[PDB]
Ligand binder design. Structure first.
Ligand SMILES: Cc1ncc(COP(=O)(O)O)c(C=O)c1O
Length: 385
């Protein structure tokens, strides 16, 4: 009833997060690294609601931030600035001075050009990690490999020497590697990390930031944590500090997306269950094509086959394609699972729609609104007439 409870009180579309899941998954990540001197951080890009970030701070997580905006979410969540790690490929001098005024002291440098700007400021107390892109076996994980050869981030790991030649003597404490997202195989991590750890040992670095990217079960895949703890963690044990930057694995399962069915449109062979939010609420299915399982609150069955689509005047405004479902009726509620990451953070106002509400079901059972629903006036809040 709990999910319907929330829809009755707060309406739809509404993301609903469970504190219990957020704490258990964050504790699960820490436990994988038992034996390691870990500084766990949460990737704010996956979910920036400060109420959820406060829960993660209580669980011992710092924050991986990219923008001023992310840094403010951390501040709103009462995160101590010495547990913030700053990532980014477009750090401007203005941004650096701002981050320095906030006492951020851990920076994952993306390029030679960024490092030259840091020297012109020459801040004291800042620890730098150099983002590197290890070569990953092209014929096996072809998708992680070309991203780490063609994407705009970091420097090739083969060019680390060229970077250290120019910048030696700055407070460079280690390397940062982040190889991708939604990874459920352990081998890519073992391959990339063994190279980065080897490189770290040549320079004698005592810290390392191994990024994030752990995948979740969207349609049946699962990252084997036993295998990961057996194959990856031992290499990490030497370091005085290991930082990880986890987003999706922690927050995605904590969230559902609730949508009310407006009508069920039949067209011969096919059926379109039209709900009250689409790509303006959850963009993943139309931008990434990711698969989220769905279900109907209070109903089970397989008598209908349908696409679940949004109300927007756009062709790929689809939440779910070809799913078996019970006989859906207008007014039913569809719940989309694994909606807690890259969900609200990618919501928008396309077709002059309003952004969804967010609610938190606390461990004590209290249902708390943590993100009100945009009004129609909110859509035009910044128009200057
Ligand atoms: C540098 C960095 N670290 C960690 C993460 C995210 O990983 P995920 O949410 O897959 O854990 C991101 C995501 O963009 C990132 O860019």
């Amino acid at each position: 009833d709990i999910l319907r409870k929330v829809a009755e009180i707060h309406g739809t579309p509404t993301y609903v997060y469970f504190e219990e899941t957020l704490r258990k998954r964050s504790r699960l990540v820490k436990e994988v690294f038992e034996g390691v001197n870990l500084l766990p951080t949460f990737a704010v890009k996956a979910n920036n609601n400060p109420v959820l970030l406060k829960i993660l701070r209580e669980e011992g997580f710092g924050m991986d931030v990219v923008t001023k905006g992310e840094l403010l979410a951390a501040k709103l969540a009462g995160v101590p600035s010495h547990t913030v790690v700053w990532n980014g490929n477009g750090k401007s001098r203005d941004q650096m001075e701002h981050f320095l005024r906030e006492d951020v002291r851990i920076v994952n440098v993306d390029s030679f050009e960024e490092m030259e700007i840091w020297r012109e400021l020459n801040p004291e107390g800042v620890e730098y990690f150099i983002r590197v892109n290890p070569e990953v076996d092209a014929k096996t994980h072809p998708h992680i490999s070309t991203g780490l050869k063609k994407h705009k981030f970091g420097i090739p790991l083969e060019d680390l020497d060229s970077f250290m030649e120019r910048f030696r003597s700055m407070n460079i404490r280690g390397l940062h590697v982040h190889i991708g997202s939604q990874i459920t195989r352990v081998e890519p991590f073992v391959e990339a990390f063994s190279k980065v750890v080897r490189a770290s040992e040549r320079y004698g670095f005592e810290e390392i930031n191994i990024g994030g990217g752990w995948g979740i079960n969207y349609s049946g895949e699962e990252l084997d944590l036993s295998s990961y703890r057996e194959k990856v963690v031992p290499d990490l044990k030497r370091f005085k500090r290991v930082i990880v930057e986890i987003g999706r694995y922690i927050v995605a399962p904590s969230g559902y997306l609730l949508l009310r069915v407006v009508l069920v449109k039949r067209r011969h062979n096919k059926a379109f269950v039209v709900v009250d939010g689409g790509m303006n609420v959850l963009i993943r299915p139309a931008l990434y094509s990711a698969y989220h399982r769905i279900f109907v609150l209070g109903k089970q069955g397989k008598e209908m086959r349908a696409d679940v689509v949004g109300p927007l005047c756009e062709s790929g405004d689809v939440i779910a394609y070809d799913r078996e479902l019970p006989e859906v009726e207008p007014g039913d509620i569809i719940a989309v699972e694994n909606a807690g990451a890259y969900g609200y953070t990618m919501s928008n106002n396309y077709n002059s729609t309003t952004r969804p509400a967010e609610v938190l079901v606390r461990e004590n059972g209290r249902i708390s609104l943590i993100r009100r629903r945009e009004t129609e006036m909110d859509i035009f809040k910044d128009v200057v007439m």
